[PDB]
């Protein structure tokens, strides 16, 4: 069999309105994920819309979307579309469908959409009781916090009154990062979170075991002499409670640290996402930017 | 194989010895190994025990 | 440290040479004062300025 | 600068003469060496030669086999090379019948020493190993030489034949009944921690999954037992800190439809092996998981 | 001032195996498709003469014997690198300055 | 038809000895702050980032955003800079003290020294200086940061000379064919502010792990069928062996994750090269690029 084609043609069977054929011309050079990887995929498989469900698990969309191959929009024309898949490491331009101000030199990750609030949804583009849904591209600091907020929301949901959960979900669903506000659609608890909470709860324990006696104690001892803003603001979160170290074994201690890094990567990755873009010089319009490392 | 040989011929001067009423060519190979970084095959050695 | 780079670009007379013990060894015993050796093409000869 | 200069089509190297031809063309000199077509002019694949002891050349002489560097604390050799099949004598995953079988072939003054270097110290094998690629066209000298493929397809020169990767059946496993039209290949070390000794557990695991998050999650189902062994070793042994249940790393990708079972043949001792076909090489860094 | 004199470059002593006297032991023949072939062979047919025996002795058979004589490949290859700067200066040319 | 290359122009006039000082460094990784087409020589190297009180960790992170670039050609005035493309091979100088061998997963690190060196010499304009980052093999690169972090944990207590004997062991890693003496990040007993943050980045995390785990493990234990979580609480209850508003739980958990994002700069490390052939005397080696 031929290797899966880099070039993909998508053709609508439903009639296209003249108002919408120009909607795609403004959509050119944007991330349009697909699953089946056909040489001539139908538009019914195009977009994230086929993955929607009554559960509306935003965490569920976060996982299923990652399995889809990413594609770049290219060559709009009469009732014909040409998606393209850049090879790894080459540079190509990418328009930002989302409303976020990209910075120079930062990595980017695909994310399921978060409604802005007013949810005017543009012309949204629809036909046949079906709507195109293109996931947003987001900066890393937004891409990182969006996962941890889904996880901390599941920890507070346990062991506490359901009415109290609403007070926490309200302050957590909002995100004021980088000027523009954001909000998380239906953060329903899910078994996909239960395994995501499982790997975090597993890392939550073992790091306490791998930690050296000189490591966990060190923050409590620094306050005896040094004082600083970061030392005070962080110390309040801790529970309220010269001297020789009990033992110092450099071979035993270097081994304790090397194992400790592995659990951190086991724990950090759940809020991490597969980086896809490494933008260089953003365009002044903030409607487009060049990208590298795509795929 | 005998018919594959090219019929072209050119003279070239040589030293020869006549032994057993038979000509035998003499030829040094010093020119093709001097100023090169591999040992000359003709110069070898024996390990008597 | 003589400007060896000029010798690699300036035209040179073609003189056959005869000498004992191979050029790699005779320069390995430092018979010459200044000398230089390198493997392959030299990039540095192209850096005219 | 000229408007016609940007109107010109992008250059085709095949239309241009080879640089050896362009130099001869000016002086019109004729060398005996062929110049009309440089070989290896068109290969995206990259390679580097690996000198090897002659006691490990077997089975590697068949094109298509994984190679890994094995760092040694000795100053010479600092990095003995190891076959993927010679690696299985140590792995617990190999069947006991197959392990006694192939081991009779690999015995040598050199290969037997490589087994001793896995017992020299506590340190785990994944730290001691580094994937290299796969051989094509063995030299088979008295000092064995191999042309490993750092990246791209394995094939014979002039594209006359496309070599296929060979993987033992004992290590191969499938994560899903429904193979996709494409699936990446992953070498994956696993450690079933245990009291007297922590055995290696090698596995080859092709899968349509590519994203690291989705891959490790399904990985915990098949390997939950070894995962249980890891925490169990901790509670039993205070002041002892084993690390890393295993390592996943990308190895390449294959067309999936081309996969079919095959067998190696040497010394009248056949060995059934999974046979990936158009396995383009794409080495990946080790990624430990617990 | 220092006094540079004439520059020198040694010329290699050209040689040819076809011209060498060692070729008298050789029988060189070009063959463009030689890479395709596996191994050559040369069958030899032989039948030994026999002499008549005297009375009371075994007689020689009309003996026949044949052999095959193969060939030995001896591939050779020589590296030589060219700098990438030589490539960019080989065909590219800027202004026609001296 | 020539391959694209970044141009660069030095400002201060160069003596012929200086331009020949640079041609000895043909292949060489050169960080670039941003993929600008033109670039002043002041932007080259880590030297624009050089700092006193700021620690080595700040160089560890900003260098990841730097664009590595080889010097494809050196002439007068303009200096070419060839940005690597992924998957192509690229020859690179062995400026790194470690000897290279086949197949190493090389990754860039900022340069270091242990007092005076036999040859600190490099290209030097007035005030300006060049700094070429090390190209260490990956297994040592973990060993570098694993030593640097532990050495700062003892910085609070230099007073016990017995502790210094352990610091002297960490100070000198001994990779084969090398005799390193890693400089102490501490200077005059006082820590660098970057060192004080990197130590806080980890110790704060391990402290929250000691207590926050006691709650969530309980409710999640009975539901699990794999049982592996059920025994995780056993070591936690034995971690006690030695001797609250709902909103407080949210702010407490929130710090535990964000500090790890600050700590991630010291954890995972990208590999930038993987070795193929090595030149004789280890002056340099070709390495296929890998982002």
Short mmCIF file of C-alpha atoms in Angstrom, two decimals, chain F:
data_model
loop_
_atom_site.label_atom_id
_atom_site.label_comp_id
_atom_site.label_asym_id
_atom_site.label_seq_id
_atom_site.Cartn_x
_atom_site.Cartn_y
_atom_site.Cartn_z
CA UNK F 1 20.93 27.65 -5.88
CA UNK F 2 23.01 28.19 -2.75
CA UNK F 3 21.47 27.05 0.53
CA UNK F 4 19.96 29.83 2.64
CA UNK F 5 22.18 31.22 5.39
CA UNK F 6 21.82 33.94 8.02
CA UNK F 7 24.18 36.88 7.55
CA UNK F 8 26.01 38.52 10.44
CA UNK F 9 28.40 41.48 10.64
CA UNK F 10 30.87 42.36 13.37
CA UNK F 11 31.14 46.07 14.16
CA UNK F 12 34.62 46.47 15.67
CA UNK F 13 37.40 46.20 13.10
CA UNK F 14 39.22 42.86 13.01
CA UNK F 15 42.94 42.30 12.61
CA UNK F 16 43.99 39.56 10.20
CA UNK F 17 45.00 37.53 13.26
CA UNK F 18 41.43 37.94 14.54
CA UNK F 19 39.64 36.83 11.36
CA UNK F 20 41.95 33.82 11.32
CA UNK F 21 41.09 33.20 14.97
CA UNK F 22 37.50 32.68 13.78
CA UNK F 23 38.24 30.44 10.79
CA UNK F 24 39.53 27.82 13.24
CA UNK F 25 35.89 27.59 14.41
CA UNK F 26 34.11 26.71 11.17
CA UNK F 27 31.58 24.20 12.49
CA UNK F 28 30.26 25.43 15.85
CA UNK F 29 26.85 25.67 17.52
CA UNK F 30 25.83 29.33 17.84
CA UNK F 31 22.66 30.24 19.78
CA UNK F 32 20.52 32.99 18.24
CA UNK F 33 17.93 34.96 20.27
CA UNK F 34 15.42 35.06 17.39
CA UNK F 35 15.27 33.91 13.79
CA UNK F 36 16.01 37.37 12.42
CA UNK F 37 17.66 37.43 9.01
CA UNK F 38 20.20 40.09 9.98
CA UNK F 39 21.91 39.87 13.35
CA UNK F 40 24.51 41.92 15.19
CA UNK F 41 27.44 40.04 16.68
CA UNK F 42 26.32 41.28 20.11
CA UNK F 43 23.32 38.97 19.75
CA UNK F 44 25.59 35.96 19.13
CA UNK F 45 26.34 33.55 21.96
CA UNK F 46 25.21 33.50 25.56
CA UNK F 47 27.40 36.53 26.31
CA UNK F 48 24.51 38.96 26.00
CA UNK F 49 22.76 36.88 28.68
CA UNK F 50 25.81 36.82 30.98
CA UNK F 51 24.88 37.64 34.58
CA UNK F 52 26.37 37.71 38.06
CA UNK F 53 23.72 36.99 40.69
CA UNK F 54 21.58 35.11 38.17
CA UNK F 55 22.41 31.41 38.21
CA UNK F 56 23.24 28.67 35.74
CA UNK F 57 19.60 27.54 35.65
CA UNK F 58 18.58 30.75 33.87
CA UNK F 59 21.02 29.82 31.11
CA UNK F 60 19.55 26.30 31.16
CA UNK F 61 16.14 27.63 30.11
CA UNK F 62 16.75 30.59 27.83
CA UNK F 63 19.18 28.44 25.83
CA UNK F 64 16.30 26.08 25.03
CA UNK F 65 14.59 29.01 23.29
CA UNK F 66 17.82 29.96 21.50
CA UNK F 67 18.08 28.93 17.84
CA UNK F 68 21.15 26.72 17.45
CA UNK F 69 23.07 27.49 14.26
CA UNK F 70 26.30 26.31 12.64
CA UNK F 71 28.77 28.73 11.02
CA UNK F 72 28.70 27.34 7.48
CA UNK F 73 31.32 29.78 6.16
CA UNK F 74 33.55 32.58 7.44
CA UNK F 75 34.77 35.52 5.36
CA UNK F 76 35.37 39.21 5.86
CA UNK F 77 32.51 41.47 6.92
CA UNK F 78 29.55 39.10 6.65
CA UNK F 79 29.54 35.75 8.47
CA UNK F 80 27.21 32.97 7.30
CA UNK F 81 25.06 30.99 9.75
CA UNK F 82 23.35 27.77 8.63
CA UNK F 83 20.30 26.85 10.71
CA UNK F 84 19.96 23.03 10.83
CA UNK F 85 16.93 21.36 9.28
CA UNK F 86 15.56 18.30 11.07
CA UNK F 87 16.68 14.92 9.77
CA UNK F 88 19.73 16.16 7.84
CA UNK F 89 23.25 15.39 9.03
CA UNK F 90 25.46 18.25 10.24
CA UNK F 91 29.15 18.26 11.15
CA UNK F 92 29.78 19.92 14.52
CA UNK F 93 32.92 20.87 16.44
CA UNK F 94 33.78 18.95 19.61
CA UNK F 95 34.09 22.10 21.69
CA UNK F 96 32.67 20.07 24.58
CA UNK F 97 35.27 18.72 27.00
CA UNK F 98 33.75 15.22 26.86
CA UNK F 99 35.08 12.95 24.13
CA UNK F 100 32.43 11.91 21.61
CA UNK F 101 31.73 8.36 20.45
CA UNK F 102 29.27 6.62 18.16
CA UNK F 103 25.56 7.24 18.63
CA UNK F 104 25.62 9.69 21.54
CA UNK F 105 22.43 11.65 22.21
CA UNK F 106 24.17 15.02 22.40
CA UNK F 107 22.38 17.95 24.04
CA UNK F 108 23.57 21.53 24.53
CA UNK F 109 24.60 22.95 27.92
CA UNK F 110 26.08 26.34 28.85
CA UNK F 111 29.88 26.46 29.18
CA UNK F 112 31.55 25.97 32.56
CA UNK F 113 35.03 26.27 34.06
CA UNK F 114 36.95 25.38 37.24
CA UNK F 115 39.14 28.44 37.69
CA UNK F 116 41.88 29.10 35.15
CA UNK F 117 42.06 26.86 32.08
CA UNK F 118 45.03 25.91 29.92
CA UNK F 119 43.35 27.80 27.05
CA UNK F 120 40.51 30.25 27.74
CA UNK F 121 41.37 32.01 24.47
CA UNK F 122 38.50 32.89 22.14
CA UNK F 123 37.56 35.72 19.79
CA UNK F 124 37.55 38.95 21.81
CA UNK F 125 36.38 42.40 20.80
CA UNK F 126 36.56 45.25 23.28
CA UNK F 127 34.42 44.26 26.29
CA UNK F 128 32.63 41.74 24.05
CA UNK F 129 33.40 38.02 24.28
CA UNK F 130 32.12 34.83 22.63
CA UNK F 131 30.88 31.78 24.54
CA UNK F 132 30.21 28.47 22.78
CA UNK F 133 27.99 26.07 24.76
CA UNK F 134 29.17 22.55 25.55
CA UNK F 135 27.85 19.59 23.54
CA UNK F 136 27.70 16.98 26.33
CA UNK F 137 26.40 13.43 25.77
CA UNK F 138 22.98 12.91 27.32
CA UNK F 139 23.81 10.55 30.24
CA UNK F 140 26.31 13.07 31.61
CA UNK F 141 23.84 15.93 31.11
CA UNK F 142 21.52 14.33 33.66
CA UNK F 143 24.54 13.87 35.93
CA UNK F 144 25.36 17.59 35.71
CA UNK F 145 22.02 18.88 36.99
CA UNK F 146 21.68 16.03 39.49
CA UNK F 147 24.89 17.27 41.10
CA UNK F 148 24.09 20.98 40.80
CA UNK F 149 20.76 20.63 42.60
CA UNK F 150 22.05 18.57 45.54
CA UNK F 151 25.02 20.91 46.00
CA UNK F 152 22.68 23.84 46.60
CA UNK F 153 20.64 21.87 49.14
CA UNK F 154 23.71 21.87 51.41
CA UNK F 155 24.40 25.56 50.72
CA UNK F 156 22.34 26.51 53.77
CA UNK F 157 24.94 24.66 55.89
CA UNK F 158 28.51 25.25 54.73
CA UNK F 159 29.45 25.53 58.43
CA UNK F 160 30.04 21.78 58.86
CA UNK F 161 33.27 20.87 57.07
CA UNK F 162 32.17 17.22 57.07
CA UNK F 163 29.39 18.27 54.68
CA UNK F 164 32.02 19.94 52.48
CA UNK F 165 33.76 16.58 52.03
CA UNK F 166 30.57 15.37 50.35
CA UNK F 167 30.43 18.57 48.30
CA UNK F 168 34.02 17.92 47.19
CA UNK F 169 32.90 14.53 45.85
CA UNK F 170 30.00 16.06 43.90
CA UNK F 171 32.32 18.87 42.77
CA UNK F 172 34.42 16.51 40.60
CA UNK F 173 32.53 14.14 38.33
CA UNK F 174 34.88 11.67 36.62
CA UNK F 175 33.54 10.54 33.26
CA UNK F 176 35.92 8.35 31.28
CA UNK F 177 38.71 10.29 29.53
CA UNK F 178 37.79 13.39 31.56
CA UNK F 179 38.58 15.03 34.92
CA UNK F 180 35.82 17.56 35.59
CA UNK F 181 35.65 19.90 38.58
CA UNK F 182 32.14 21.37 38.49
CA UNK F 183 32.19 24.89 40.00
CA UNK F 184 30.14 25.45 43.13
CA UNK F 185 27.11 27.63 42.26
CA UNK F 186 27.45 29.06 45.77
CA UNK F 187 29.72 32.09 46.12
CA UNK F 188 30.75 33.50 49.52
CA UNK F 189 28.34 31.10 51.24
CA UNK F 190 25.37 33.11 49.96
CA UNK F 191 23.21 31.46 47.28
CA UNK F 192 22.40 32.86 43.87
CA UNK F 193 18.75 33.87 43.54
CA UNK F 194 18.31 31.36 40.71
CA UNK F 195 19.73 28.65 42.97
CA UNK F 196 17.42 29.73 45.80
CA UNK F 197 14.42 29.36 43.48
CA UNK F 198 15.47 26.00 42.01
CA UNK F 199 15.87 24.57 45.52
CA UNK F 200 12.51 26.02 46.53
CA UNK F 201 11.03 24.60 43.31
CA UNK F 202 11.59 21.04 44.55
CA UNK F 203 11.50 21.17 48.36
CA UNK F 204 8.09 22.86 48.33
CA UNK F 205 6.74 20.04 46.15
CA UNK F 206 8.00 17.18 48.32
CA UNK F 207 6.57 18.88 51.41
CA UNK F 208 3.07 19.09 49.90
CA UNK F 209 3.31 15.45 48.83
CA UNK F 210 3.81 14.39 52.46
CA UNK F 211 0.38 15.63 53.58
CA UNK F 212 -1.91 16.18 50.58
CA UNK F 213 -1.74 12.49 49.64
CA UNK F 214 -3.32 11.36 52.93
CA UNK F 215 -6.81 12.46 51.81
CA UNK F 216 -7.28 11.62 48.12
CA UNK F 217 -5.74 8.14 48.39
CA UNK F 218 -8.47 7.09 50.84
CA UNK F 219 -11.53 7.70 48.65
CA UNK F 220 -9.77 6.39 45.53
CA UNK F 221 -8.48 3.17 47.14
CA UNK F 222 -11.65 1.07 47.43
CA UNK F 223 -12.83 1.84 43.88
CA UNK F 224 -9.59 0.55 42.33
CA UNK F 225 -9.49 -3.05 41.13
CA UNK F 226 -5.76 -3.08 40.29
CA UNK F 227 -4.99 -2.83 44.04
CA UNK F 228 -1.72 -1.03 43.28
CA UNK F 229 -3.13 2.17 44.80
CA UNK F 230 -4.24 0.27 47.92
CA UNK F 231 -0.65 -0.45 48.94
CA UNK F 232 0.50 3.11 48.18
CA UNK F 233 -1.10 4.26 51.44
CA UNK F 234 0.93 1.69 53.39
CA UNK F 235 4.22 3.51 52.80
CA UNK F 236 2.45 6.81 53.53
CA UNK F 237 1.21 5.56 56.90
CA UNK F 238 4.76 4.31 57.51
CA UNK F 239 6.04 7.72 56.37
CA UNK F 240 4.57 8.90 59.71
CA UNK F 241 6.96 6.55 61.55
CA UNK F 242 9.51 9.21 62.64
CA UNK F 243 8.05 11.03 65.66
CA UNK F 244 -9.24 23.92 57.50
CA UNK F 245 -11.36 25.80 54.96
CA UNK F 246 -12.30 24.01 51.72
CA UNK F 247 -10.87 26.98 49.82
CA UNK F 248 -7.51 26.37 51.51
CA UNK F 249 -7.35 22.95 49.83
CA UNK F 250 -7.70 24.54 46.39
CA UNK F 251 -4.91 27.09 46.81
CA UNK F 252 -2.75 24.38 48.39
CA UNK F 253 -3.18 21.95 45.48
CA UNK F 254 -2.79 24.80 42.99
CA UNK F 255 0.76 25.57 44.09
CA UNK F 256 1.78 21.92 43.87
CA UNK F 257 1.31 21.78 40.10
CA UNK F 258 2.50 25.26 39.11
CA UNK F 259 5.81 24.76 40.94
CA UNK F 260 6.42 21.63 38.86
CA UNK F 261 6.01 23.74 35.72
CA UNK F 262 8.74 25.99 37.09
CA UNK F 263 10.75 22.85 37.90
CA UNK F 264 10.30 21.35 34.42
CA UNK F 265 13.23 23.38 33.06
CA UNK F 266 15.57 21.21 35.17
CA UNK F 267 13.81 17.89 34.45
CA UNK F 268 13.22 16.89 30.83
CA UNK F 269 16.00 17.65 28.35
CA UNK F 270 15.68 17.82 24.58
CA UNK F 271 18.35 16.04 22.56
CA UNK F 272 19.70 18.20 19.74
CA UNK F 273 21.98 15.72 17.94
CA UNK F 274 22.84 12.05 17.63
CA UNK F 275 26.34 11.04 16.56
CA UNK F 276 27.33 9.02 13.52
CA UNK F 277 30.98 8.86 12.45
CA UNK F 278 33.72 10.46 14.56
CA UNK F 279 36.82 12.10 13.08
CA UNK F 280 40.30 10.99 14.19
CA UNK F 281 41.70 12.63 17.34
CA UNK F 282 38.10 13.59 18.19
CA UNK F 283 38.48 17.17 16.96
CA UNK F 284 34.94 16.94 15.56
CA UNK F 285 32.26 14.51 14.43
CA UNK F 286 29.30 14.52 12.07
CA UNK F 287 25.90 14.22 13.76
CA UNK F 288 22.51 13.83 12.11
CA UNK F 289 20.24 16.54 13.47
CA UNK F 290 17.27 15.74 15.70
CA UNK F 291 15.11 18.41 17.32
#
